[PDB]
Structures are given as C-alpha cells and as structure tokens.
Design a protein around this ligand. Sequence first.
Ligand code: CLA
Ligand code: CLA
Ligand code: CLA
Ligand code: CLA
Ligand SMILES: CCCCCCCCCCCCCCCC(=O)OC[C@H](COP(=O)(O)OC[C@@H](O)CO)OC(=O)CCCCCCCCCCCCCCC
Ligand SMILES: CC1=C(/C=C/C(C)=C/C=C/C(C)=C/C=C/C=C(C)/C=C/C=C(C)/C=C/C2=C(C)CCCC2(C)C)C(C)(C)CCC1
Ligand SMILES: CC1=C(/C=C/C(C)=C/C=C/C(C)=C/C=C/C=C(C)/C=C/C=C(C)/C=C/C2=C(C)CCCC2(C)C)C(C)(C)CCC1
Ligand SMILES: CC1=C(/C=C/C(C)=C/C=C/C(C)=C/C=C/C=C(C)/C=C/C=C(C)/C=C/C2=C(C)CCCC2(C)C)C(C)(C)CCC1
Ligand SMILES: CC1=C(/C=C/C(C)=C\C=C/C(C)=C/C=C/C=C(C)/C=C/C=C(C)\C=C\C2=C(C)CCCC2(C)C)C(C)(C)CCC1
Ligand SMILES: CCCCCCCCCCCCO[C@@H]1O[C@H](CO)[C@@H](O[C@H]2O[C@H](CO)[C@@H](O)[C@H](O)[C@H]2O)[C@H](O)[C@H]1O
Ligand SMILES: CCCCCCCCCCCCO[C@@H]1O[C@H](CO)[C@@H](O[C@H]2O[C@H](CO)[C@@H](O)[C@H](O)[C@H]2O)[C@H](O)[C@H]1O
Lengths: 341, 37, 334, 37, 39, 450, 60, 78, 32
Amino acid sequence: RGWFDVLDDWLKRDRFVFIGWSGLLLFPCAFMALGGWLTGTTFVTSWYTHGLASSYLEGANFLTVAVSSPADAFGHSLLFLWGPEAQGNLTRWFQIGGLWPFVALHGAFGLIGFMLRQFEISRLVGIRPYNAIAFSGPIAVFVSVFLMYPLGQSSWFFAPSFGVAGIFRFILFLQGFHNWTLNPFHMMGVAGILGGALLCAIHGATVENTLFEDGEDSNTFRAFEPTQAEETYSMVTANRFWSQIFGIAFSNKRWLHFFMLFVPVTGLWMSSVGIVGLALNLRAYDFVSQELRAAEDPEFETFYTKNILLNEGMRAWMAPQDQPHENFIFPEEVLPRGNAL
Amino acid sequence: MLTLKIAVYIVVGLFISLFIFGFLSSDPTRNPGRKDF
Amino acid sequence: ASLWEQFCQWVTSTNNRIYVGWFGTLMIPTLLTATTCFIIAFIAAPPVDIDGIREPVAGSLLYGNNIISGAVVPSSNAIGLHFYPIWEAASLDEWLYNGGPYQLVVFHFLIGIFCYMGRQWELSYRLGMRPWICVAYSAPVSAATAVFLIYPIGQGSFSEGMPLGISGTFNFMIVFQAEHNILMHPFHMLGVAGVFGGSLFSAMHGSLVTSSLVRETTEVESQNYGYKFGQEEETYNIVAAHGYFGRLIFQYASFNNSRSLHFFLGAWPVIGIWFTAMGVSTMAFNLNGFNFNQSILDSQGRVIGTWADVLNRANIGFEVMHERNAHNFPLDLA
Amino acid sequence: KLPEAYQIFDPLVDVLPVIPLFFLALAFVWQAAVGFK
Amino acid sequence: MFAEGRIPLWVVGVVAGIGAIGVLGLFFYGAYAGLGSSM
Amino acid sequence: GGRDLPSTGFAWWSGNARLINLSGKLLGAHVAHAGLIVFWAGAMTLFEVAHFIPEKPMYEQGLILLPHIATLGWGVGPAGEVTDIFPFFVVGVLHLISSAVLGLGGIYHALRGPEVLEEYSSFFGYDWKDKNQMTNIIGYHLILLGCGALLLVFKAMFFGGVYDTWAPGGGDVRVITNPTLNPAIIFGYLLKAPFGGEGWIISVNNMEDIIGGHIWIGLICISGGIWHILTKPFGWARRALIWSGEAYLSYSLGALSLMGFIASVFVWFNNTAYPSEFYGPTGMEASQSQAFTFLVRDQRLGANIASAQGPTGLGKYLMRSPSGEIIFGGETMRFWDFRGPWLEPLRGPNGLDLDKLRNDIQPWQVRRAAEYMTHAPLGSLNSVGGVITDVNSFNYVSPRAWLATSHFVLGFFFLVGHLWHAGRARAAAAGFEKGIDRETEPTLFMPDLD
Amino acid sequence: SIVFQIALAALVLFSFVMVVGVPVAYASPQNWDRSKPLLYLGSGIWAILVIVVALLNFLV
Amino acid sequence: GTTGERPFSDIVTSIRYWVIHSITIPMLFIAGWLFVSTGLAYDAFGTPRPDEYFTQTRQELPILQERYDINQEIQEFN
Amino acid sequence: NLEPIFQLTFLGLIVLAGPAVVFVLAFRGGDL
Ligand code: CLA
Ligand code: CLA
Ligand code: CLA
Ligand code: CLA
Ligand SMILES: CCCCCCCCCCCCCCCC(=O)OC[C@H](COP(=O)(O)OC[C@@H](O)CO)OC(=O)CCCCCCCCCCCCCCC
Ligand SMILES: CC1=C(/C=C/C(C)=C/C=C/C(C)=C/C=C/C=C(C)/C=C/C=C(C)/C=C/C2=C(C)CCCC2(C)C)C(C)(C)CCC1
Ligand SMILES: CC1=C(/C=C/C(C)=C/C=C/C(C)=C/C=C/C=C(C)/C=C/C=C(C)/C=C/C2=C(C)CCCC2(C)C)C(C)(C)CCC1
Ligand SMILES: CC1=C(/C=C/C(C)=C/C=C/C(C)=C/C=C/C=C(C)/C=C/C=C(C)/C=C/C2=C(C)CCCC2(C)C)C(C)(C)CCC1
Ligand SMILES: CC1=C(/C=C/C(C)=C\C=C/C(C)=C/C=C/C=C(C)/C=C/C=C(C)\C=C\C2=C(C)CCCC2(C)C)C(C)(C)CCC1
Ligand SMILES: CCCCCCCCCCCCO[C@@H]1O[C@H](CO)[C@@H](O[C@H]2O[C@H](CO)[C@@H](O)[C@H](O)[C@H]2O)[C@H](O)[C@H]1O
Ligand SMILES: CCCCCCCCCCCCO[C@@H]1O[C@H](CO)[C@@H](O[C@H]2O[C@H](CO)[C@@H](O)[C@H](O)[C@H]2O)[C@H](O)[C@H]1O
C-alpha cells in the first residue's frame, strides 16, 4: 500500500463530515474566511479606513457590522500580514482593513475547494457533476463582484464590505454611480433569480398538489419511500392542469429540472458579465437620445430622466461620507435638491 | 359618457351574475370524486 | 338538459383547452380589458400629470420612450384615491392627461389575477387535485396587490402605485428606499432570503435531479429523451442524490423524502414573498425599515458613523431630488 | 401610572403581556416531552 | 431524570432553547442600553 | 381520542386537526384560547396603565387599549385629557380575572371533560353535518352579538355617552340623545364607493351615525339569530355550500380576513370612531396640518396666501380640487377629502374660506396643527419618529400605524387561511385531499387537449 | 396600607400555586378522588381572595 | 446509516457529557467576557475605546493616506 | 435599580412555571 493511496483511503472515508482531497483546500480556507468575518464584525473597526464603526465592540448591531474594505490609499495591495503595509503587526493589519483581503482571498479559495468537493463527491458517489456546474454561478458572482469590480476600480475600498448594511451601501452605490438597474445584464440577472424563485415555488406546489394517494394518513409525507420505483406525483395531471391554466406545461421531468438549474445559474452569469462591465465604469448609465431631447426640450420627462436626477442627488449627498479619503467638501449650496426639501 | 357608463354597468353586472349563479348551481358536485354532499 | 346546465357544464369543463370556470368568466374579460388598454397606452398614451402639478410625464413609445423607459404612468396625485373611470371624465383626452388608463389597467388586472388564483383552485378541484397551488400563487398576487393597491391606499393616492414600466418600476423602488428604507426592513430581507434561497434551491433541486438521471439514452441524443411523458417509473435516482448531498454537507442536512423536499421547495420562496408583500403593505402605513442613524455616539457625544449612516446619506440624496417640483413644505408627510 | 396601592407589583405587570408566547412555546415543550407524536 | 444514567432530550432542548432565547433577549436589550442605543 | 399520528393520521404540526370530531376537547381549546384573548386584554391594559403618563398624549406612549377605553368615554374629559386613571385599571382587572376563569374552564374541557358532547346532551352535542344544530349555534352567537351592539348603544345613550371628537366646544364625552334610526343614511353608508371622497363605511363622521348603525346592527343580529334558530338551511344554501367543520372554519376565516382589512383601513382613515386625541392624527390629518401650519406662519409674515403661486403654477397654500373645492396645496392636494374638528371651522360651502383663514384662526387650531404635523404616522420599526432620513432622537410610531399594519398583515394571512381551508374542505368533502388514486386518476380518463 | 399589600401578595402566590396545580390535577386522573375536592376548595379560596382584594381596594 | 460516530442524541443526553460541559461552555463564556471587560480586545485589535475616536489634537476622521508607513500614521492619528 | 431584578425574577418564575407543569406530568406519569 503506497502512502498516497493510504492517504486517499483516509481522506475519502464515509464519516460524518466528508473531507476528501478537496477538503485540504476547503476547510482551512473556509474556516479562515468565516473566522475572519466573525472576528472583524465582533472586534475590528473601520475607523481608519472609512471613518466608521463596524464591530459589535463599537456598538453596531448585526445589520450594521462589517469586515469593511481597506483604505483607498493602498490601491489593490493584497495587504498581507507580513506585507509592506502591516509589516507583521497584527494590530496595524486589523486597523488598515487587511481582514478584508484575508476574508475575500480565503473565501475565494474556499469556494474553489467547495466546487472541488462537489466534483470529488460526485465522482465518488457516481453521479454527474451538475451541482458543481450549478455552483459556477455563485463563484462567477463572487469573482466578478468581490474581486474584479474593485480590481477595475481604483482600490479595494470600492469593493463591497462583508456586512449587511455594507452590502446595502454597495447596492445603493451601484445604483447612484452606475445606474445598475438600467443595465440589461442586471435585468437578466433579476429575471433569472425571480424565475428561479418562481420555478422553485411552482414546482414544489405542483408536486405537493399532484401527489398520488399512496397512504392512508392525512399526513401525505409518510406515503413516500426513497427506494420506490414509481413517481410520487402525477406528471400527467400536473401537465393537464398547467396546460389549461397557463397555456403551456412541462411534459418532460428531466427538461423541467434542467430548466430549474438553467434559469438562476444563467441569471448569475449574466449579472456577473454586467458587473465586469461596471468594473471599468462601462455602464448602461444613459439613453443619449432622451438626454439630447431633454436638454433641448424642457417639456420632455420620462421615468428614465427622473431616475437620472435621483442618481445625481444620491451621488452628491453620499460621496463626502462614502469616500472620506477624497476629502470631498461639498458646501450646502451646491447640493442638488428639489423645492422645500 | 352616460352610455358608456350604462354599457359597462350592464356588462359587469352580467358577468358578476354569471359568476354568482354558476357558483350557486351545485358547484360542489362538479368534481370527479364523490358528488353527493 | 336545461340551457343553463349546458352552459354550466361548458364553463366547468375539463375538456376545454384553456380552462374557463366561473373564476375564468371574471378573469378573461378583466384580463383582456387590462391587456388591451395596457398595450394601447404603452404604445400611444399622451403624457400623464402623475404628480398633479401640471408636469406631464411622457410614458408611451410614440412620445419618445423606448421599451426600458416606457410606462403606463400612474394616475394624477390630484385624483388621489378617487375612483376615475372614463365616464367620470369630461373627455377622453382629459382622462388620458390625468392617468385614467393606469386606474383602468390596474383595477381590471387585480381582479383578473385574483380570479386567476380562484381559477387555479377551480381547475385543481375539477381535476381531482389537491388544492394549494393557488396558495403558492397568492404570494405574487399579494406582492402585486401591495405595489398596485395597498401602497396607494396607505399613501392616499394612486399616483404612488408602481408604474407599469421598467424604468418606472426602478423609480418606484428608489423613492421607496429614500422614504421607507426598505433594505433595512426585515420583511424585505426575508423576501431577499426567499428569492435568493428559492433560486438556490431551484438550482440545487435541478442540479441534483439532473446529476442523478438514470441512463436511458446514448451519448448522442439529449438526455431529456430518457423520460417519457406519463411513464410510471422514476427518471432519476433519489437515493444517489441523497447520498451525494448528505456527503456534501452532512447526512442529516439532506432530504430523503421527495414530498418533504418539494414541500420545502414550495414553502420557502412563497413565505419569503408573503413576508416582503407584507413589508411593502406595512410601509404603506409608514411603518418603515430600521432607523439606526446616529445610533453610535462616543463618550463626548459625537456621532460615530456606521454603514447605516452612509446608507442614510444615500437615502437623503434620493429623497431631496425626488418629485423635485411637487413639495412646497419642509416635510414629506406622505 | 399604576395606582399607588398597586405599585408593589409593577415589575410583574411589566412581564405579564408576554405570557401568550410562553403558552405557544409550551405547546412545543409538551410536544417534545411526548415525543412529537 | 426518568431513566438510568440518562437525561431526557426534551429537557436538554428546553434548557438550550431558553439559553438561546436569553442571549437573544440580552442582545436585544443591548440595543436599548449602552453602546449603539443612540443615547 | 387519538393523541398520536398512527391513531389519527395527523402529524403533530397539524395536531389540532385531531380535534375536528372531538367536540368536548374542541370546546376546551376554544374556551382556553378565548381565555388567552381576555388575558392579553387584561394584562396589556395593566401594562399600558403602568406605562401611562396621563399628562402626555396616549398616542405618544405606544398605547392601543387605553384609546379604545377612552373612546367609550371612560376616564376622559374635554380634548381627551385623562381625568381618572381608575376606569382603565378596572377594565384591565376585570379582563384578567375573567381570563383566569376562562382558562380554568378551557383546561377542564380540554383535559377532563367528555371528549364528545353528543353522548351527554343533545343541546351542546353538535355534529358538523347536522345543519340545524350548527344554525342554532349561529343563532345563539348572533343573539349575543346583537346584545353586545346594543350594549355599546346603551353605553353611549344611557351610561355617560362616548367621546365625540366633533362636539361643539371641542371633543368631549357626550351622551348621544338622537341616534339616526333612518335606514336610508345607515344603509347608504353601505352603498358608498370604497374610494376617495366616499370611503364606504370608513367615512362615518359622527357619533350619531355610529350609534344608529349599532342599533340597526343589534336589531339585525337579534333578528338573524332568531332566524337561524327557527329555520333550517334552504335548498340553495345546501346545494351551494360545503357542510363540514373545516368548511365552516374557512368561511369564518374569509370573514375574518375581510374584517381585518376593514379595521386596518378604519384605523388609518377614520378619526371619528378613532379620535385623533387618542390615536394621533391620521396620515391625511398630518399632511393637511403641515399645509395649514405653514399657511398660518406665512400669513403671519405678510404673505398673500390666496394669490401666492407656487413654482409649478398651482397655489403654494391654496388650490382647487378636481371638482373645484378650495383645498390646501402641495402634495396634500391628494388628502383634500380629509375632515377634522380643527379644520371644519375654516371650511365654507365652497371649501376653505378665505375670510375665515384671514381672520378666524384660533391659537388652539395652530397648536393642534403643529402637534398633528409633528406626530404624522411615520416611523421606523425601531420606533424612530419622523421621516426615515431623520436621525435617532424621537421615539414615536403612531398607534394608527401599528394597528393598521398589524391588522392588514392579519387580514392577509387569514385570507391565506381561508384559501388553504376552503380548498382543503372541498378536497376532503370530494375525497381527494390525500392525493390522486392511481387506479381512478381522473385525468387518465379525459380526452387529450390537442 | 401594608395589609392590602399582604393580601395582594397572597393572591399572586395562590395564583402561582393554582397555575402549577390546575393542569397537573386535570392531567392526573388516577389521583382524581384526591385532586377534585381540593381543586374545588382551591377555586373557592381563589375566588375569596379576589373579592377581599377588591374590598381592600375600596378600604385602602 | 451511522457512519461510525456516536449519535449526538446519545452524547448530549449523558451525565458525563454534561459534567464536562456544565464547566467548559460557561467558562468559555466567561473567557469571552473577560476578553471584553478587561479591555484586552481594544488593545488586541486596535479598536478605539469610546474616548479615542477623536483626541484633543485631532477632531476629524483619521483616514489613512500613507501607503507604506501606516504605523507612524496611526501613531500620530492616535 | 432593583426593578430589573424584580422583573427578571418574575420573568424567571413564569418561564419556569410551564416546564415545571410538563416536567411534573412527565415524572409522575401524567396523561400527557
Ligand atoms: C391556543 C393554543 C392551543 C390550545 C387551546 C390547544 C388545545 C389542545 N390541543 Mg394543541 N397545539 C397547539 C396549540 C393549542 N392547542 C400548537 C401551537 C401545536 C403545535 C405544537 C399543538 C399541537 C397539538 C397536538 C399534537 C395535539 C394537540 C391536542 C390538543 C387538545 C388536548 C391536549 C392534551 O390532551 O394533552 C395535554 C397536555 C398537557 C397536560 C401538558 C400541560 C399543558 C397545560 C395544559 C398548560 C396550560 C396550563 C396553564 C399554565 C394553567 C392555567 C390554568 C389556571 C390555573 C389559570 C387540546 C384541546 C391533542 C389532541 O388533538 O387531542 C385529542 C394532540 O394530539 N395539540
Ligand atoms: C363557550 C363556553 C362553554 C360551553 C358551551 C360549555 C358547555 C358545557 N359545560 Mg362548561 N365551562 C366553561 C365554558 C363552557 N362550557 C367555563 C368558562 C368554565 C369555568 C367556570 C366551565 C366549567 C365547566 C365544569 C366544571 C363543567 C362544565 C360542564 C359543561 C357541559 C354541561 C353544562 C350544562 O349544561 O349545565 C347547565 C347550564 C346552566 C345551568 C347555565 C348556567 C349559566 C352560566 C353558567 C352562567 C352565565 C355565564 C355568564 C355569567 C354570562 C356571559 C359570559 C361572560 C363571559 C360574558 C356543557 C357541554 C359540565 C360537564 O363537564 O358535562 C358533563 C361540568 O361539570 N363546564
Ligand atoms: C354571522 C352571522 C350569520 C351566519 C353565520 C349566517 C349563515 C347563513 N345564513 Mg344568515 N342571516 C344573518 C346572519 C348570519 N347568517 C342575519 C344577521 C340575518 C338577518 C338579515 C340573516 C338572514 C338570512 C336569510 C333570509 C337566509 C340566511 C341564510 C344563511 C345560510 C346560507 C347563506 C349563504 O349562502 O351565504 C351566501 C349568500 C349568497 C350567495 C347570496 C348573494 C349575496 C351577495 C354575493 C352578497 C354581496 C356582498 C358583497 C360582496 C360585500 C359588500 C357588502 C354590502 C354591499 C352587502 C347560512 C348558514 C339562508 C338560509 O339558508 O336560511 C336558513 C337564508 O335564506 N340568513
Ligand atoms: C382561527 C383560525 C384557524 C383555525 C382554527 C385553524 C385550524 C387548523 N389549521 Mg389553519 N390556517 C389559518 C387559520 C386557522 N387554522 C391561517 C390564518 C392560515 C394561514 C397562515 C392557516 C394555514 C394552515 C396550514 C398550512 C395548515 C393549517 C392546518 C390546520 C389544522 C391543524 C393545525 C394545528 O395543529 O396547529 C399547529 C401549530 C403550529 C405547528 C405552530 C404554528 C406557528 C406559526 C408557524 C408561527 C406563529 C406566528 C405567531 C404570529 C407568533 C410569532 C412567534 C414569533 C415571535 C417567534 C387545524 C384544524 C393544517 C391542516 O390543513 O389540517 C387540516 C395545515 O397543514 N392551517
Ligand atoms: C402551522 C403553520 C402553517 C403556516 C402556513 C405556512 C405553511 C404553508 C406554506 C406553503 C405554501 C405553498 C402551498 C403549496 C404547498 C402545499 O401544497 O403543501 C402540501 C403539504 C402537504 O401536507 P398534507 O396534506 O400531508 O398535510 C396538511 C393537511 O392536509 C393536513 O395536515 O402541506 C403542508 O406541509 C402543511 C404543513 C404546514 C405546517 C408547518 C409549516 C410551517 C412553515 C411556516 C413557519 C414560519 C415561517 C416563517 C418563519 C421565519
Ligand atoms: C482573523 C484571523 C485569524 C482567524 C481566526 C479565526 C479562524 C477565528 C475565529 C472565530 C470564530 C469561528 C468565531 C465565532 C463566532 C460566533 C458567533 C458570534 C455566533 C453567534 C450566534 C448567534 C447570536 C446565533 C443566534 C441564534 C440565531 C439568530 C438563530 C437560531 C437561534 C440562535 C439563538 C442560536 C487568525 C488567528 C488565524 C490570524 C489573524 C487573522
Ligand atoms: C389546552 C392546552 C394548551 C392551552 C392552554 C391554555 C390556552 C391556557 C390557558 C389559560 C389562561 C387563560 C389563564 C389564565 C390566568 C390568569 C390569572 C391566573 C390571573 C390573575 C390574577 C391576578 C392574581 C391578578 C392580580 C393583580 C391584580 C388583582 C391587579 C393588580 C395587578 C395584579 C397582577 C397583581 C396548550 C397550548 C398549552 C397545549 C396543551 C393543551
Ligand atoms: C355599525 C355601524 C354602521 C352599520 C353598518 C351596517 C348596518 C352593516 C352591515 C352589513 C351587512 C349586512 C353585510 C354584509 C355582508 C355580506 C357578505 C360579506 C357576503 C357574501 C358572500 C358570500 C360569502 C357569498 C359567497 C358565494 C357566492 C359568491 C355565490 C355562490 C355561493 C357562495 C356562498 C359560494 C354604520 C357604517 C352605518 C355606522 C358606523 C357603525
Ligand atoms: C397572570 C399572573 C400569573 C399567571 C401566569 C400564567 C397565566 C401562567 C403561566 C405560564 C406559562 C405559559 C409558562 C410557560 C412557559 C414556557 C416556556 C419556557 C417555553 C419554551 C421554550 C422552549 C425553549 C422550547 C423549545 C423547543 C422548541 C420550540 C423546538 C423543539 C422542542 C423544544 C422543547 C426543544 C401568575 C400565576 C404568575 C401570578 C399572578 C399574575
Ligand atoms: C480572534 C483572533 C484574535 C486576534 C489575535 C489577538 C492578538 C492580536 C495582536 C495583539 C498582539 C500584540 O500586538 C502587536 O502584535 C504584533 C505582531 O503582529 C507585534 O509586532 C511585532 O512583531 C511583528 C512580527 O515580526 C513585527 O511587526 C515587528 O517585529 C513588531 O511590531 C506588535 O509589537 C504588537 O503591538
Ligand atoms: C345588471 C347590472 C346592472 C346594470 C343595469 C344598470 C345600468 C346602469 C344604471 C345606472 C346608470 C347611470 O347612472 C347614472 O349615472 C349618471 C352619470 O351620468 C349620474 O349622473 C350624475 O353625474 C352626471 C355627470 O357624470 C351629472 O351630469 C348628473 O347631474 C349627476 O346626477 C346619475 O346620478 C346616475 O343615476
């Protein structure tokens, strides 16, 4: 017995927590990312990077804590603990926001390890690896949003902070500065996510309401056993119902479930392509025909032009606080505002 | 305007009367199971 | 035998290609009316004075909009919650100016989708099904009623209802955030949990079923031809899928009963969308999202910002610029 | 405020509204003790 | 408690749930007192 | 009496469904839950009294039960000032003690009484299929509901009256001596449009209208009670309805959903049965108050508030409604149908009168408008008052907001309950609530759709 | 003064004894011949305490 | 069904388990408590206490602007 | 102040009162 094959035996035992070869990448990296996030949201400030309190130690709550992005002065420095910024000082590393690339990098390598775990367990069990192919969507989202968006921007500062209200800030920032709702790549993402939620709800309700009477109890859940051969619900009845209700219906179970896979994964990939565009400020910010008309004609108003005005107001009122390294002094008279508010 | 109002009131009332009288006309028995009630 | 009984049998027939039913006798006229008026208004309605300040907003394609910016603009703020049919207008042009098409489309659409939910029950009853597909459909219905009816009622004007367009929806959402802080509302958070988890679990379910398909085709043809419509037997190995998923996380995190799995798949996004419908319906009465602004102070008393304070700066910037010409007083009371 | 003679049991009055959730959760406690039958 | 060498699992569960409710209630109390209470 | 799922076919999370055909235990569950309702009423009233500053407005202190007691005319005087703390405490104590009695009774029937009441008495024994006994129970509950409506009428007419926010001299506890018995007014409240300016029954604007409607409701309920006790259901009712316990539950769920929606709209819009001295201003009241407050302030600065045009061309302070009435300008144009006791003094036949605005505005109207504008029903979930962009220093959410939000959520989830139980009742009476029979699957015998 | 407080403390303590004892006695049928009279007595005692608290509320 | 490990419901319903944990879990709780209450967490992570957000010589936000010499920058920020 | 002390003691008594009933009926053999 070779030592590699003995180690392969030990790593792929049937235990409570499967390890595998992928676990050597997954578990230390996922533990580092999760412990870094919990450590930062419990103890670590954003006072020197953002001028903000973002830990439970400062009095923030679960909504208002974050592992915030590092200072804009560092650019896209990877901000290693031993790196030229922190210089080995753990306290300085915490204060300059090094927990953000710590969490983001270990998280990215843990996500790699998780899709590798999906591949490894799919190979061992003997099934096709479509769970890993489906998980390509979340990794596309993580790579485009937390990595390539700040890389395209000036620093890691403009990456989303690992927090609830920090993510809400990133979301509103992308509305006001990028017009990300107007981007068709995000619209395909929204369509994919709402379609995935629709398909989940409709598929579950259809199965639960086309169940076969396979038991004597009103509790229908005990009328199923996993080792049975026949279908637990009537695809014919479900097909007839949705054909007469909606006009069309699924007639193929395998196509139904591939579509349930396909819709949100494709939405995530499309929104990722849009975030890649936004990394370089390649926005769908404006419809130039409507601005040219609105500049020439003061009677022309659409909901698009109203959204443009909303974005301008948000940018001017948020940027001095959201980007304190820039020292944006906007006196009150230059702030755009409507009548009386 | 009065003609359109009368026409819409008649159309809406006819559809609502259809709905009501249909659900009053032994709709529980219009099912493939046990139609006794 | 009777003419009425023959009509009742035709109406309730399971042999209709599209099921009508008694709910369909209300659904079809209302939905056809709303569809026809929406299409005509989206293409060719004149501009609508939504804020009631004689500042008409071009909503239709013939007046300079594209598909993204086009909308059926909500009725005038001067109307408020007043019932504004065609026969209450002195002319059709006045009706178009004051946003009557929005009221017509929205009222017939809301009746139609409530009757769609009733019809879903009706056909499940005629087909000998269990009846709770309409309960799952009640979550999008509640969300639609929240944004088209309940939010206007609580705000006191149908001008506050979501516009029937893409950029109009974005405008509704941005003004909603600036006024109610919906992102900080936990019901919206539950909705985001519902849609993110529903898409997650849709991807999971689909990926596990596609992963555990029984080999019934060659490598040339599509694997979907391994399933025959109306086959008795299972098209995929649930035990293999459970073995994979209980090794991917751990054994007791994986469903083995397909009925519990599908009840969970139904229940998660439906409950999430119910909660977010109630969140929008409760911010109709101005019960807003969490206000943590200036919640952290130092020992002197100076405000230490958090991410909620930056979010509030964004909300203020959205608020001071919204309906720029409609406000005359210092507070946006509704 | 409470009347003065009833100012001894003000903390008990403070805790009295929440006893319905205690009842709702005791239903789960009893179902756990009987085994979720 | 009613067994040999054993504690009922529902007793363990009610104790753990009471502790979890207590720490959640303490965390909600701290929203209105001390840091982050806006006072 | 099955108390497990092998003996019932209902799991523990559906375990009260095991009580459907066990009448005495079902009566015990009800009485025990009723006791819960009266317990909350008593304990919450004691809490609200213990957390009451009586020189402070009730709407400032997060109270919802003390406004209900004060609206009935207990412990209050002119403009809603609390004269006596004791009646609120009495109402609390009475509910709390009756709840102890009801909880003992519910626990008795649920844990020691006859499990089925049909082997003990034909009067309380009910079978769900027995249409006559269920209509008798309808009739009993109808008689007592009519008595409760007449008890409200007796309180308003012979026991010190109720709070009239529209009373001359300001709102006060007054005795209703002339309730409107006119069926035209009472039942044309039912035919009014549920839209702007009409408001269906939410627009009931005087205590005489409310009390006359409650006399009519009491008479109607007592007559209908005697009806269901003296008659059996007719053939159209038997042929249209499902006759089962889950069906009757779902019918009541649909009614409850309707009533919760109506209560949310009622507390949001009506300031007559929900007076603003206790529940705070409505959203419409606060917006009209803001417009009136700044009209008064700018008129004191010498501005011609009639001829002042705003930036849009409409009047800044005064404009016309779409039917031509002189109304406040700004976004509050949408709230022009608002009527309030502080504003009706300045309303002429054509709307807001210029002469009254010029020289008849009293300081109490200015004070009331400033208070109502600064107490608009706008607030964060964590009870931070004002617009959501405000900082954290004002601890306020209106009781109108809390009540409307809660009862709208309850009404929606009870519509969901109606749908769940109406569908399950139909499926169970039809026999396919447990799933499709494989041998007699109905779709398998139908022609193909194409 | 304090006599009414002692009566109210006795009322809340006997309510505590009753809220412990009532579901135990209604779910102990084999002890019913022991449980039924005392429960009767307990209800009567509780009622008397309520009344005397009321009387002392109008005596204080 | 069982991969080899002792079932959790057997483990947490044991006398010896709760004898070990009645001690370990509360004393981990008090270890976190003494991490915060002795003030060691502020020094460990560099989080300001409620009176070192601003000093008497700095009343603005101490936004780092140095790219490499941040230690001296945090020192003069205090 | 002693008001949170009394509040939490009353809360502790009422939170234990229910599981005390369930625990007594489990221990002595009640008809649970
Ligand atoms: C308002 C809430 C409410 C009420 C009134 C009831 C009532 C009832 N349920 Mg129930 N239930 C509920 C909520 C409720 N449930 C919830 C939320 C769930 C989901 C977990 C369940 C799940 C459930 C199941 C699985 C079953 C019931 C059953 C029953 C019936 C008999 C219970 C029994 O015999 O065992 C007795 C239980 C005990 C003796 C434990 C002690 C509990 C006591 C009663 C606590 C209350 C005492 C109180 C503190 C003292 C105050 C009195 C006074 C001194 C002031 C009964 C009528 C059973 C049934 O259907 O009957 C055939 C049954 O099988 N329920
Ligand atoms: C909706 C509530 C309700 C209903 C329908 C019942 C029904 C029943 N009970 Mg029950 N009970 C209840 C609540 C209820 N109870 C409450 C709250 C308590 C605590 C006091 C009890 C305690 C109880 C016991 C100890 C017993 C019953 C018994 C019975 C059965 C026979 C009673 C009888 O006919 O004698 C004749 C009826 C009368 C003489 C009518 C007298 C009028 C009443 C008692 C007073 C008026 C009530 C109130 C003052 C008016 C308004 C109510 C207020 C809250 C607004 C019967 C099926 C007996 C049984 O188990 O059957 C074998 C039995 O021994 N009950
Ligand atoms: C809450 C108390 C209560 C309850 C539970 C019942 C229950 C019942 N009643 Mg009764 N009734 C009551 C109060 C009550 N009633 C009162 C207070 C009176 C005095 C006026 C009556 C007078 C009465 C008569 C004369 C009859 C009944 C009948 C019935 C039975 C069938 C009714 C039916 O099919 O509904 C459905 C009704 C229809 C399908 C008819 C169409 C009605 C339209 C759709 C209503 C429109 C409402 C609209 C949507 C809402 C807007 C509000 C407003 C504009 C109206 C049923 C068991 C019938 C029976 O069986 O005799 C014993 C019967 O003929 N009742
Ligand atoms: C008074 C009205 C009423 C009554 C008598 C019933 C009665 C019944 N229902 Mg129904 N239902 C109702 C309203 C009602 N329902 C409403 C409003 C809804 C929509 C939500 C439903 C949806 C519903 C479903 C989906 C089902 C039932 C079922 C049942 C049966 C058994 C349920 C059970 O054991 O309880 C058990 C109680 C629990 C398991 C605990 C529930 C706790 C919920 C989930 C959260 C509590 C939230 C609450 C506001 C407190 C917040 C706590 C928070 C602070 C942590 C029973 C006969 C079952 C059935 O069909 O059998 C015939 C069933 O499957 N109902
Ligand atoms: C008691 C809780 C009921 C609340 C309603 C929510 C559950 C139903 C939602 C499903 C909607 C989709 C409809 C089609 C789906 C469909 O058709 O379902 C079918 C499924 C099968 O049930 P059976 O027919 O076997 O039994 C149900 C009845 O027929 C008799 O028991 O129904 C259920 O599982 C009901 C169980 C709900 C009881 C527990 C659920 C608790 C979940 C909510 C908890 C709170 C969530 C928020 C917390 C943050
Ligand atoms: C950073 C770093 C690191 C790491 C660390 C670690 C890895 C750690 C950790 C850690 C951890 C790992 C921590 C933790 C935690 C936790 C917490 C803080 C929790 C919580 C919770 C809660 C609060 C919950 C609650 C609840 C809910 C809500 C649900 C249900 C119910 C209950 C109650 C349970 C080192 C040293 C390497 C180096 C430097 C850097
Ligand atoms: C069946 C059942 C159930 C239920 C139960 C219930 C629902 C109940 C109840 C009950 C109740 C409903 C109760 C009660 C009570 C009350 C009491 C016990 C009271 C009292 C009193 C007193 C003692 C008072 C005092 C006072 C005064 C005089 C005034 C001042 C203040 C004070 C507070 C001190 C459950 C779910 C668990 C499940 C199992 C079965
Ligand atoms: C107190 C008051 C008042 C009065 C009120 C009254 C006098 C009333 C009433 C009322 C009434 C007198 C009502 C009602 C109702 C009804 C309902 C809610 C219904 C219904 C329906 C149903 C449920 C049906 C169903 C169905 C159909 C649809 C057809 C087929 C068959 C069936 C059954 C399925 C006033 C405002 C003046 C003033 C203030 C306070
Ligand atoms: C008025 C008054 C009173 C009364 C009271 C009452 C009325 C009663 C009661 C009571 C009660 C009513 C109690 C209770 C409780 C409870 C509890 C403590 C619960 C819970 C919990 C938990 C934690 C659970 C958990 C769980 C779940 C949910 C899941 C699974 C299963 C288990 C079990 C684990 C007294 C006498 C004081 C005095 C005078 C005044
Ligand atoms: C939940 C996780 C817990 C977090 C860990 C808790 C400890 C955090 C660090 C506090 C320890 C001392 O805090 C700081 O440590 C660093 C090491 O990083 C020391 O730094 C020292 O060694 C490092 C490593 O060569 C170099 O930078 C330099 O030689 C010197 O500065 C600092 O002098 C001390 O101020
Ligand atoms: C089968 C279901 C029922 C269908 C049958 C009923 C058909 C419709 C009957 C009502 C007909 C229209 O009803 C009538 O509407 C007109 C609208 O001009 C109203 O008229 C009102 O408004 C108009 C202008 O809008 C004013 O000029 C007029 O002075 C005023 O009275 C009447 O007050 C009402 O009586």
